[PDB]
C-alpha cells in the first residue's frame, strides 16, 4: 500500500485485476492482539434441580446388538435402503 | 482333525517342494556373492543356506513346512530382484554381535540370565 | 448442487475460430502468463528480517517447557504423576519422596525432548498449572543429550520465562 | 435423554435388519449369524469358504450392488482357535448403504483370494498377510508390503511385542547398516488402567 | 432425443435400449428357470426381474422410464442387467440353496471374550 | 556320451571333486545313505553336480532313485542315446 500510483497503475494493467482492493499483506484491518476478556457460557446440564445423571446418561444406554439370525411366504424383496435420489443441476453455476 | 490343506496332501509333496527351493537357493549363492560384492565365499554362502535348512528340519506338519517353502520362496524373490541390499543379504552372518556364552560357568560370570 | 467442469462446447462460428488460431499463431495466453509474473514482481513481497523481525504468535503457543513455582517461592509440583500418565510420548518420569519438612515433592522429574510431541496434554492435566509449555522455541542445541532436561533445567526454565508464562496464563485461562 | 445423547435412526435400523433376513434366507449354505449394531450397522458373519461367493452376491445383486470395497481387515483374538477374523467393509453407491461381512481362519487355513471380485483387495488383504501371517490362496502377487525385507515375525499379532526383537545400528567396521539384539535405554512403563468397578450392565456377561 | 453422453467415463451411450433390457430380462428369466424353485434367490430375483421387465415393457419413452425405473441412467440399467445374469449363471454354478456347511465353535462370535 | 565306461568315469570324477565324500569308502556300487553317510541335501547337491557337468536337466522325481553311482550311470545311459 505504500506503492507509487504509477506502479499501481502498471501492476492493475499487467495483472488484468483492481489488486489495490484485495492486498493479500495484511494492515490495520486485522483484530487486535490484545482482547477485552470473556465470559464463556455453560452447557444444559449446569441447573440444581430436575438434573438427575441416570436421565441424561448417554454410555449407558448402549445395548448390544441385536443379533436378527443365528445358528445356535410371498414376501417382497428388499434393499437396504430406498434407492438415492438424482443429483440436481446447481442453478448458481451449472457451468454450461 | 480333517483340515484344509495349502499345497502339499501329504509328506512326499511338502518334500518335494524343499528340495526344489533348496536347489534354486544353491543355484542362487553364486550369483549373489558376485552382484552383491560380498566379502564371503560361495561355500559360506551355501553352509550359511544349508545350516537354515537343518535349523529349520525338525518339522512334521505339511501346513507348516508349506508355509515355510513360501515364506523362502518369497525370500529368494527378494534376493532375485536387486530389492535387498548388502545389509540386507548379510543379516544372516551376524558378524557385529559378541558371540554368546553357552557353558554353565560363563552365563554365571556375565549376568543372571539362564 | 453439482456443477459440470470441462464439459463446454467451443463455438463453430468463423470469428470463434479465428480468435482460436489467432491464440494458437501469436501466444495469447503465454503472454497473459508473462503479465501475471510480470505484475506479480512489483509487489512488496512478504519478507520478513528474521532474526530482528519475528512471526505472530498466540498466548496459548507450546514451547519449550518449564516448571512453575507459587508467588512465595514454593514450587507448584505436589508430584501427583498426572502429566506422567496422560503423556502419549511417555517422555516424562517422575520419582518422589517426602521432603524435610514433610510436603509432598518431586526428586526427580525428566522430560526427554526428543520424545515429547509438545502436545500440551501435560499442562492440561495439571491441577496446580505447575508444568506448562512456555513461548520459547528458539532452544536448539548441538548434542543429543543436551535435550535430556531434568528437574533442575526445568526451574530454571520457569524461573527464566516466568514473566512471559505467568502474562500468558493470565490472558488465557478464561477460555479453559 | 435429549441434548447430550446420540439420537436413534430406527428407520435405517428396520431397513438393516429387514435385509440381513433377506442376506441370511438368500444364501443360507454359508452365513452363520447377522447383527445389526444399536448404531445401525449390519454385520454379517459367514462361514469362510463362502467368502467367494458371498460377495460376489454383494457386488452383483440387483438389491444390493456393493460395488465399493471401502475396507479389509484382520484382527487377532488370541482366545479363539481361529484367532484371525477377517472383515470387508462394502459400500453401496446405488442404495447408500455399507455392510460388513466377517470370517474366521487360524494361522494354518488358507483363504481364497478376493481379487476377482475386488481388485483394491489386491493390495488389502496382502497387507493382511505382512501383518498376520494370514495366506491368500490363488493371489496373483502375495508378498509383504510394509515390513523390511529381512523382517522375521509378523507385528501385528498380540503375542508380538511392541518393540521387535532386532534394531539396526550404523557400524563402522564393516562400514554397514546392522541389525542387533533389542536394547532400550528406557523401558517402555506399562500401566494397569483399568478399574475394578463395572461399568457398562448391559454387557454383563453369565457366570460359570 | 439421441443423447449426447451418459456422463460416465468409458460407458457408451446405447443407441436401443428398450429390445436390449428385454432380451437381457428374458435371458435372466431363461437361466433362472434351472434353479429349484423352493430356493429363495430364485424367487427374489424372478419377482423383481418380472417387475422391471413390465416396467420396460409397458414404457415407450426413455427419459422417464429412466426417472421411474430408479436406476440412474438406461446404461448403468442395461449393465446391471448383464451383471444380474453372470450372477445367475454363478448362482447356478455355485448352489447356495443347500444348509449350512459347517458349525462355528461355541465363542467364535463372542465379543467381548 | 559316447561309451558307458567314458559316462561311468565322468560320475567318478565328478564324485572325486565332491568334499565331504571320502575317498578311500567310495566305489561304484556305494550307496549315498547307509554306506557313504550322506544326508538329503547331499544327494541333492550331487543330483546338480551331475547337471552341471553334463549340461543336462534332471527333474526330481527322476533323481530320488539314483540312490549310487550306478542307477546315476544307468540314468544318463538311458536318457541320451550312447
Ligand atoms: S506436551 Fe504432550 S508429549 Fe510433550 S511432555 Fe506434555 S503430555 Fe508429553
Ligand atoms: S500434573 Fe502437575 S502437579 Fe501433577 S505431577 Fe505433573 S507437574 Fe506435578
Known amino acids: 500500500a505504500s506503492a507509487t500510483r504509477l506502479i499501481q497503475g502498471l501492476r492493475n494493467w499487467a495483472s488484468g485485476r483492481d489488486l489495490q482492493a484485495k492486498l493479500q499483506l495484511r494492515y490495520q484491518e486485522i483484530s487486535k492482539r490484545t482482547q477485552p476478556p470473556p465470559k464463556l457460557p455453560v452447557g444444559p446440564s449446569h441447573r440444581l434441580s430436575n438434573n438427575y445423571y441416570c436421565a441424561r446418561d448417554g454410555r449407558r444406554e448402549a445395548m448390544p446388538p441385536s443379533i436378527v439370525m443365528s445358528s445356535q411366504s410371498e414376501k417382497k424383496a428388499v434393499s437396504p435402503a430406498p434407492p438415492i435420489k438424482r443429483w440436481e443441476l446447481s442453478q448458481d453455476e451449472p457451468y454450461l | 482333525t480333517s483340515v484344509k490343506p495349502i499345497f502339499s496332501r501329504d509328506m512326499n509333496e511338502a518334500k518335494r517342494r524343499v528340495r526344489e527351493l533348496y536347489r534354486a537357493w544353491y543355484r542362487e549363492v553364486p550369483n549373489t556373492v558376485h552382484l552383491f560384492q560380498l566379502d564371503i565365499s560361495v561355500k559360506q554362502g551355501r553352509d550359511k543356506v544349508r545350516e537354515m535348512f537343518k535349523k529349520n528340519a525338525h518339522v512334521t506338519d505339511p501346513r507348516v513346512v508349506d508355509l515355510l517353502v513360501i515364506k523362502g520362496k518369497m525370500e529368494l524373490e527378494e534376493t532375485i530382484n536387486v530389492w535387498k541390499q548388502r545389509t540386507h543379504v548379510m543379516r544372516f552372518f551376524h558378524e557385529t554381535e559378541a558371540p554368546r556364552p553357552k557353558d554353565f560357568l560363563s552365563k554365571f560370570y556375565v549376568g543372571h540370565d539362564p | ?176 | 435423554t435429549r441434548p447430550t445423547v446420540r439420537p436413534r435412526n430406527d428407520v435405517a435400523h428396520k431397513q438393516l435388519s429387514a435385509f440381513g433376513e433377506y442376506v441370511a434366507e438368500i444364501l443360507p449354505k454359508y452365513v452363520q449369524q447377522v447383527q445389526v449394531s444399536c448404531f445401525s450397522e449390519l454385520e454379517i458373519c459367514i462361514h469362510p469358504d463362502g467368502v467367494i461367493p458371498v460377495l460376489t452376491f454383494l457386488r452383483d445383486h440387483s438389491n444390493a450392488q456393493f460395488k465399493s470395497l471401502a475396507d479389509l481387515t484382520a484382527v487377532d483374538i488370541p482366545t479363539r482357535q481361529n484367532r484371525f477374523e477377517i472383515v470387508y467393509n462394502l459400500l453401496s453407491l446405488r442404495f447408500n448403504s455399507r455392510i460388513r461381512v466377517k470370517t474366521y481362519t487360524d494361522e494354518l487355513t488358507p483363504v481364497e483370494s478376493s481379487v476377482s471380485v475386488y481388485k483394491a483387495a489386491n493390495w488389502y488383504e496382502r497387507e493382511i498377510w505382512d501383518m498376520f501371517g494370514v495366506f491368500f490362496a490363488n493371489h496373483p502377487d502375495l508378498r509383504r508390503i510394509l515390513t523390511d525385507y529381512g523382517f522375521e515375525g509378523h507385528p501385528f499379532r498380540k503375542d508380538f511385542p511392541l518393540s521387535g526383537y532386532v534394531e539396526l545400528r550404523y557400524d563402522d567396521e564393516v562400514k554397514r547398516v546392522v541389525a542387533e539384539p533389542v536394547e532400550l535405554a528406557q523401558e517402555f512403563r506399562k500401566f494397569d488402567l483399568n478399574s475394578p468397578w463395572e461399568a457398562f450392565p448391559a454387557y454383563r456377561q453369565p457366570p460359570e | 432425443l439421441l443423447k449426447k453422453t451418459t456422463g460416465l467415463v468409458g460407458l457408451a451411450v446405447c443407441e436401443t435400449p428398450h429390445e436390449r433390457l428385454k432380451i437381457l430380462y428374458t435371458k435372466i428369466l431363461d437361466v433362472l428357470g434351472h434353479i429349484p424353485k423352493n430356493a429363495a434367490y430364485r424367487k427374489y430375483t424372478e419377482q423383481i426381474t418380472n417387475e422391471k421387465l413390465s416396467i420396460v415393457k409397458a414404457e415407450p419413452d426413455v427419459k422417464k422410464l429412466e426417472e421411474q425405473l430408479q436406476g440412474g441412467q438406461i446404461e448403468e440399467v442395461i449393465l446391471q442387467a448383464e451383471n444380474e445374469l453372470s450372477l445367475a449363471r454363478k448362482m447356478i454354478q455355485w448352489k447356495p440353496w443347500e444348509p449350512l456347511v459347517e458349525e462355528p465353535p461355541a465363542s467364535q462370535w463372542k465379543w467381548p471374550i | 556320451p559316447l561309451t558307458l565306461e567314458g559316462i561311468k568315469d565322468r560320475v567318478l570324477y565328478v564324485l572325486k571333486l565332491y568334499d565331504k565324500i571320502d575317498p578311500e569308502k567310495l566305489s561304484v556300487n556305494s550307496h549315498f545313505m547307509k554306506d557313504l553317510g550322506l544326508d538329503s541335501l547331499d544327494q541333492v547337491e550331487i543330483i546338480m553336480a551331475m547337471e552341471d557337468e553334463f549340461g543336462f536337466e534332471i527333474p526330481d522325481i527322476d533323481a530320488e532313485k539314483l540312490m549310487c553311482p550306478q542307477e546315476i550311470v544307468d540314468y544318463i545311459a538311458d536318457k541320451k542315446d550312447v
Open chain 3, 1 to 176: 448442487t453439482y456443477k459440470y467442469v470441462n464439459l463446454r462446447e467451443p463455438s463453430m462460428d468463423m470469428k470463434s475460430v479465428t480468435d482460436r488460431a489467432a491464440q494458437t499463431l501469436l501466444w495469447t495466453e503465454l503472454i497473459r502468463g508473462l503479465g501475471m509474473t510480470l505484475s506479480y514482481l512489483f509487489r512488496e513481497p512478504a519478507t520478513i528480517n528474521y532474526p530482528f523481525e519475528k512471526g505472530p504468535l498466540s498466548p496459548r503457543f507450546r514451547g519449550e517447557h518449564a516448571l512453575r513455582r507459587y508467588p512465595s517461592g514454593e514450587e507448584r509440583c505436589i508430584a501427583c504423576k498426572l502429566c506422567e500418565a496422560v503423556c502419549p510420548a511417555q517422555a516424562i518420569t517422575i520419582e518422589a519422596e517426602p521432603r524435610a519438612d514433610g510436603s509432598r515433592r518431586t526428586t526427580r522429574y525428566d522430560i526427554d525432548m526428543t520424545k515429547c510431541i509438545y502436545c500440551g496434554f501435560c499442562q492440561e492435566a495439571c491441577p496446580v498449572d505447575a508444568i506448562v509449555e512456555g513461548p520459547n522455541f528458539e532452544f536448539s542445541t548441538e548434542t543429543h543429550e543436551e535435550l535430556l532436561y531434568n528437574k533442575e533445567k526445568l526451574l530454571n526454565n520457569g524461573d527464566k520465562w516466568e514473566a512471559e508464562i505467568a502474562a500468558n496464563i493470565q490472558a488465557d485461562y478464561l477460555y479453559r
